[PDB]
């Protein structure tokens, strides 16, 4: 997954913590 720090979408959801803020994980 990414990390949470890492950045994301509400596309990504393969987020180390699930959610990914707006715009980070």
Same mark, same amino acid.
């Given at each position: 997954?990414? =990390?949470? =720090?890492? *950045?994301? $979408? @509400?596309?990504?959801?393969?987020?180390?913590?699930? $959610?990914? @803020? *707006?715009?980070?994980?």
């Amino acid at each position: 997954c990414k =990390g949470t =720090g890492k *950045s994301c $979408s @509400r596309i990504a959801y393969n987020c180390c913590t699930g $959610s990914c @803020r *707006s715009g980070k994980c």
